[PDB]
Amino acid sequence: QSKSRKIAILGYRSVGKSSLTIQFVEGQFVDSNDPTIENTFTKLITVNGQEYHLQLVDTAGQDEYSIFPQTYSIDINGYILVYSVTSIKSFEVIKVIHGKLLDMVGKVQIPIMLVGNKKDLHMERVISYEEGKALAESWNAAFLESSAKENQTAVDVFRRIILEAEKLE
Numbered sequence: 545q546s547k548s549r550k551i552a553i554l555g556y557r558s559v560g561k562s563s564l565t566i567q568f569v570e571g572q573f574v575d576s577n578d579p580t581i582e583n584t585f586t587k588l589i590t591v592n593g594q595e596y597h598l599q600l601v602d603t604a605g606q607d608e609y610s611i612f613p614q615t616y617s618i619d620i621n622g623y624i625l626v627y628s629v630t631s632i633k634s635f636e637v638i639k640v641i642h643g644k645l646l647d648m649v650g651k652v653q654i655p656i657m658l659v660g661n662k663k664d665l666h667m668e669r670v671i672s673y674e675e676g677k678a679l680a681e682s683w684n685a686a687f688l689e690s691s692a693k694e695n696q697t698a699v700d701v702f703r704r705i706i707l708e709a710e711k712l713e
């Protein structure tokens with residue numbers, strides 16, 4: 545049997561939302577992408593013996609002034625909130641996006657996963673692992689660091705959001 549679940553991937557511009565999603569879906573790293581308008585993939589994945597049809601909504605980068613789109617606040621089973629460990633701006637912005645998201649969804653509990661991407665860029669890192677982890681803990685959210693170059697880290701991100709969604713019955 546298969547379960548159908550819809551996941552939105554959100555964050556600031558150029559944090560690697562598309563590259564992470566593509567690494568998961570297609571198993572390859574894309575060196576340069578167009579800025580996203582909106583893409584949607586359906587990917588088969590098994591989590592704890594359960595097969596899922598994952599509908600993955602890869603969204604346009606938002607900044608702190610972006611209206612959080614209402615279409616992403618209904619009928620979504622899980623959220624992946626992505627920043628880059630190389631960008632302080634992306635980290636400030638993900639805090640704003642999170643607040644707007646929580647406003648939109650209202651009194652329904654939603655699974656949220658915070659992801660610090662581009663961890664392979666050691667020389668450009670400006671955010672520690674610990675600051676990301678502390679933020680996730682304050683949100684009661686899952687936390688992982690990832691690299692879109694590293695297939696296992698991308699797979700782990702999508703498995704984890706599913707694990708978290710399942711916990712909410």
Ligand SMILES: Nc1nc2c(ncn2[C@@H]2O[C@H](COP(=O)(O)OP(=O)(O)NP(=O)(O)O)[C@@H](O)[C@H]2O)c(=O)[nH]1
Pocket residue numbers: 555556557558559560561562563564574575576577578579580581603604605606661662663664665690691692693
């Ligand atoms: N070294 C490294 N580069 C990455 C990683 N993730 C993304 N990039 C690079 O960073 C740039 C932006 O990636 P992209 O996936 O387009 O980011 P995005 O969040 O989808 N941008 P947008 O919000 O405009 O749709 C690309 O050049 C991409 O190859 C990563 O984990 N490591």
Ligand SMILES: [Mg+2]
Pocket residue numbers: 561562563577578579580602603604605
């Ligand atoms: Mg993109």
